[PDB]
Enzyme design. Structure first.
Site, mmCIF file in Angstrom:
data_model
loop_
_atom_site.group_PDB
_atom_site.id
_atom_site.type_symbol
_atom_site.label_atom_id
_atom_site.label_comp_id
_atom_site.label_asym_id
_atom_site.label_seq_id
_atom_site.Cartn_x
_atom_site.Cartn_y
_atom_site.Cartn_z
ATOM 1 C CG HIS A 1 -1.856 1.086 1.306
ATOM 2 N ND1 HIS A 1 -2.471 1.630 0.121
ATOM 3 C CD2 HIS A 1 -2.171 1.882 2.275
ATOM 4 C CE1 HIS A 1 -3.183 2.817 0.478
ATOM 5 N NE2 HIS A 1 -3.233 2.864 1.847
ATOM 6 C CB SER B 1 -2.112 -2.750 -7.115
ATOM 7 O OG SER B 1 -2.487 -3.286 -5.823
ATOM 8 C CE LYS C 1 -12.195 -7.411 -12.500
ATOM 9 N NZ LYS C 1 -11.584 -6.412 -13.394
ATOM 10 C CG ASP C 2 -11.086 -9.038 -4.779
ATOM 11 O OD1 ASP C 2 -11.025 -8.848 -5.973
ATOM 12 O OD2 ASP C 2 -10.370 -8.513 -3.913
ATOM 13 C CD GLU D 1 -1.490 -32.512 -2.358
ATOM 14 O OE1 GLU D 1 -0.974 -32.558 -1.026
ATOM 15 O OE2 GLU D 1 -2.480 -32.131 -2.355
HETATM 16 C C1 HEM Z 1 0.282 -16.292 1.491
HETATM 17 C C2 HEM Z 1 -0.272 -16.010 0.166
HETATM 18 C C3 HEM Z 1 -0.378 -14.812 -0.327
HETATM 19 C C4 HEM Z 1 -1.297 -13.622 -0.223
HETATM 20 C C5 HEM Z 1 -2.452 -14.123 1.001
HETATM 21 C C6 HEM Z 1 -1.028 -12.699 -0.738
HETATM 22 C C7 HEM Z 1 -1.815 -11.450 -0.831
HETATM 23 C C8 HEM Z 1 -1.767 -10.377 -1.644
HETATM 24 C C9 HEM Z 1 -2.822 -9.458 -1.553
HETATM 25 C C10 HEM Z 1 -4.063 -9.229 -0.956
HETATM 26 C C11 HEM Z 1 -2.589 -8.553 -2.692
HETATM 27 C C12 HEM Z 1 -3.000 -7.453 -3.127
HETATM 28 C C13 HEM Z 1 -4.181 -7.973 -4.484
HETATM 29 C C14 HEM Z 1 -3.387 -8.034 -5.637
HETATM 30 O O1 HEM Z 1 -2.590 -7.458 -6.225
HETATM 31 O O2 HEM Z 1 -3.683 -9.561 -5.999
HETATM 32 C C15 HEM Z 1 -1.218 -9.138 -3.067
HETATM 33 C C16 HEM Z 1 -0.226 -8.620 -4.235
HETATM 34 C C17 HEM Z 1 0.880 -9.092 -4.648
HETATM 35 N N1 HEM Z 1 1.632 -10.147 -4.028
HETATM 36 FE FE1 HEM Z 1 0.836 -11.512 -2.702
HETATM 37 N N2 HEM Z 1 -0.025 -12.875 -1.471
HETATM 38 C C18 HEM Z 1 0.615 -14.081 -1.384
HETATM 39 C C19 HEM Z 1 1.614 -14.570 -1.832
HETATM 40 C C20 HEM Z 1 2.489 -13.865 -2.614
HETATM 41 C C21 HEM Z 1 3.678 -14.365 -3.155
HETATM 42 C C22 HEM Z 1 4.313 -15.670 -2.903
HETATM 43 C C23 HEM Z 1 4.430 -13.422 -4.083
HETATM 44 C C24 HEM Z 1 5.879 -13.396 -4.235
HETATM 45 C C25 HEM Z 1 5.891 -14.296 -5.524
HETATM 46 C C26 HEM Z 1 3.645 -12.255 -3.884
HETATM 47 C C27 HEM Z 1 3.699 -11.088 -4.285
HETATM 48 C C28 HEM Z 1 2.822 -10.275 -4.604
HETATM 49 C C29 HEM Z 1 2.929 -8.926 -5.469
HETATM 50 C C30 HEM Z 1 4.346 -8.622 -6.228
HETATM 51 C C31 HEM Z 1 1.851 -8.196 -5.368
HETATM 52 C C32 HEM Z 1 1.669 -7.014 -6.177
HETATM 53 C C33 HEM Z 1 0.667 -7.161 -7.311
HETATM 54 C C34 HEM Z 1 0.866 -6.041 -8.296
HETATM 55 O O3 HEM Z 1 0.786 -4.765 -7.936
HETATM 56 O O4 HEM Z 1 1.028 -6.444 -9.432
HETATM 57 N N3 HEM Z 1 2.183 -12.586 -2.989
HETATM 58 N N4 HEM Z 1 -0.732 -10.281 -2.423
#
Ligand code: HEM
Ligand code: 3PE
Lengths: 403, 189
Positions: free
Chosen positions: B10, B14, B36-37, B80
């Site tokens: 934040h 995004s 949408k979510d 798995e």
């Molecule tokens: C435990 C599981 C995860 C949860 C609950 C989680 C949660 C979230 C949420 C709520 C967002 C904001 C909404 C969205 O852009 O989709 C987000 C964005 C993001 N997450 Fe995660 N995430 C997880 C795993 C990961 C992992 C493993 C990575 C690294 C590879 C990651 C990297 C990012 C990035 C880079 C964004 C920015 C999206 C963008 O602006 O393009 N997340 N995540």
């Protein structure tokens, strides 16, 4: 004890209305049911440009000699144009009553549009518009009219687009003049030290020649973002009832209840069975959303939780208002002309007081729920309006989940 | 850690699929990306309940329904399916240690990813050569997922060895060189 407004009618259909009073100066005007609503997008600035040309000389009084006459008695000459009405009014002394009427006769008929003048008034109008953009609230209210009445003749402005202004000719003007200046759509209104019989005789003598011959609100949004401006102007409106619908009075009381942004003004603009009822506020960017939230809450409070004390306060504010206005001769004549054009009669102040005192809190919240609750508004913003919320947030603020 | 993940984001907001600065066009989240979510939650619940109520064992292994016998070994041992890509890599490297390390790098190579960005454009919406390399990367990730399943015998092994070599060479070498070439094509480099 207020003197009644007496209305007569000539054969032409020109209703000659007058309301005598002691004051020795009078405001004699001509009100024509012709505005930008009667224009068909090919002559969108014809009324405005004719309003510019109407004081530049007639056939009988060529050029500035005409205005020399209205200097000679020390009278004041004014004209204005709205989307529905056009007015040409003179403030003068009582003893100069005949010649003034004769002057007004020339201004409505026998007027002369000089081609030379047409170019000069085009540069005046063009330039003013080129600088009119400066007045923000005018820009915001024009944007509100455009986005609320999309596709209708009520969206287009009184001034028209520069395009038409440049592209206008005597004949076109002549048409608008010969088409929308009919005698049955004309009121000769007089207020102050005038006798009705003398004014009727003067209207019979001159002005007896005047020839005798779906509005929709669209809940929408226009956002003109320009971040270099220091302040932001936002107008939010819903559809109004119109001129002839009496709950306007109740809605006026509601506006008197509302009366966080540097400037907050409520409006009830009425046209023929339509209108815009809402609020315009001018604010710094970082406050805008909070204002909107504030404002919407007040509207929903008037839809849900109106009490008798604020209704009594709004009734007192309305009474004083209408009576404070309607004080000087002009304000009055103006009321006579609009009353004969819109209602077809002059509504006396006693009838206004009766319609005010019949308003209570229950019918106020009923009428406010009829016109404000769960309605799609028209939003017009100009300035740093990024924090101005988009249409879903405003539309969701147009109702409460708790009722 | 997900709360920390949301915070560290934040601060920056995004990203968008064009990869450009979206500050001129931003909207609220409540009425636009909430419904949408909610729709995405409903679709994910549809897929989850058709996975549970109709094919409850298409992703699991049947041999997990036998009790744990230390004396009896299974003929073929798998984790798995989502561990498979890693499994393939581990099996590919001859050295045990090498396998473990490569395996770890398999996941860690991602962390290493922000230091390999050599392009002047953030997203791949306007970058077709790196798009092709990305889909080849997804392709041999699917290949490594398949190989893990296959037993130890020709030619599954060679594919595994290549697929791992191609995976590490596309992430480490091919994408920054392609980004340099793409910058050269737009008269930027
Ligand atoms: C435990 C599981 C995860 C949860 C609950 C989680 C949660 C979230 C949420 C709520 C967002 C904001 C909404 C969205 O852009 O989709 C987000 C964005 C993001 N997450 Fe995660 N995430 C997880 C795993 C990961 C992992 C493993 C990575 C690294 C590879 C990651 C990297 C990012 C990035 C880079 C964004 C920015 C999206 C963008 O602006 O393009 N997340 N995540
Ligand atoms: C490319 C030659 C030119 C093609 C021109 C096609 C006509 C273009 C003009 C008409 C419009 C047709 C539709 C256009 C869609 C958008 C434009 C487009 O698709 O361009 C062609 C595309 C991208 O081209 P671009 O990035 O500009 O340069 C090509 C570099 N080879 O490039 C392609 O479409 C071809 C991509 C081929 C990728 C093959 C990958 C094979 C390897 C996969 C390995 C997977 C893993 C295998 C196992 C690994 C482990 C062992």
């Amino acid at each position: 004890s207020v003197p009644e407004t007496q209305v007569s009618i000539l054969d032409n259909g020109l209703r000659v209305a007058s309301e005598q009073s002691s004051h020795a100066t009078c405001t004699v005007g001509v009100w024509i049911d012709a505005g930008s609503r009667y224009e068909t997008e090919k002559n969108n600035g014809a009324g405005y440009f004719l309003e510019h040309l109407a004081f530049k000389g007639t056939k009988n009084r060529p050029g500035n000699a005409l205005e020399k006459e209205v200097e000679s008695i020390g009278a004041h000459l004014n004209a204005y144009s709205t989307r529905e009405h056009t007015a040409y009014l003179i403030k003068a002394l009582s003893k100069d009553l005949p010649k003034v009427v004769e002057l007004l006769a020339d201004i409505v008929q026998n007027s002369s549009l000089e081609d030379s003048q047409i170019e000069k008034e085009r540069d005046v109008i063009l330039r003013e518009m080129q600088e009119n953009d400066a007045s923000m609230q005018n820009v915001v209210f024009d944007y509100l009219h455009a986005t609320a009445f999309q596709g209708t003749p009520l969206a287009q402005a009184v001034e028209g687009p520069s395009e038409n202004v440049r592209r206008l000719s005597r004949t076109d003007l002549t048409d608008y003049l010969n088409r929308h200046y009919k005698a049955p759509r004309m009121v000769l209104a007089a207020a102050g030290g005038v006798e009705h019989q003398q004014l009727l005789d003067l209207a019979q003598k001159h002005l007896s020649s005047v020839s005798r011959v779906p509005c929709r609100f669209t809940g929408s949004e226009i956002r003109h973002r320009d971040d270099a401006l220091p302040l932001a102007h936002v107008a939010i409106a819903v559809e109004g009832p119109g001129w002839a619908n009496p709950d306007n009075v109740t809605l006026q009381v509601a506006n008197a209840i509302i009366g966080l942004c540097q400037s907050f003004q409520t409006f009830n603009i009425s046209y023929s069975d339509t209108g815009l009822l809402g609020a315009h506020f001018v604010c710094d960017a970082m406050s805008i959303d909070d204002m909107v939230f504030f404002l919407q809450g007040q509207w929903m409070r008037l839809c849900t939780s109106a009490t008798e004390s604020e209704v009594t306060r709004g009734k007192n504010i309305l009474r004083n208002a209408l009576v404070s206005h309607l004080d000087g001769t002009t304000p009055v004549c103006e009321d006579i002309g609009r009353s004969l054009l819109t209602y077809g009669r002059r509504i006396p102040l006693a009838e206004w007081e009766s319609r005010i005192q019949e308003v209570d809190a229950q019918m106020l919240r009923d009428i406010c729920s009829k016109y404000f609750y769960d309605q799609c508004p028209a939003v017009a913003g100009y300035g740093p309006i990024e924090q101005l919320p988009d249409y879903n947030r405003i539309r969701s603020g147009m109702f409460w989940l708790r009722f | 850690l997900a709360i920390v993940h949301l915070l560290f984001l934040h601060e920056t907001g995004s990203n968008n699929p064009t990869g450009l600065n979206s500050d001129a066009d931003k909207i609220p989240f409540h009425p636009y990306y909430t419904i949408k979510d909610i729709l995405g939650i409903l679709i994910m619940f549809l897929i989850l309940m058709t996975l549970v109520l109709f094919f409850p064992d298409m992703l699991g292994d049947p041999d997990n329904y036998m009790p744990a016998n230390p004396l009896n070994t299974p003929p073929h041992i798998k984790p798995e399916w989502y561990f498979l890509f890693a499994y393939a890599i581990l099996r590919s490297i001859p050295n045990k240690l090498g396998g473990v390390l490569a395996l770890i790098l398999s996941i860690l190579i991602l962390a290493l990813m922000p230091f390999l960005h050599t392009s002047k454009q953030r997203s791949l919406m306007f970058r077709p050569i790196t798009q092709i390399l990305y889909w080849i990367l997804v392709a041999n990730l699917l290949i490594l997922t398949w190989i893990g399943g296959q037993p130890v015998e020709h030619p599954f092994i060679i594919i595994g060895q290549l697929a791992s070599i191609s995976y590490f060479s596309i992430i480490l070498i091919l994408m920054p060189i392609s980004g340099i070439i793409e910058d050269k094509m737009l008269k930027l480099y």
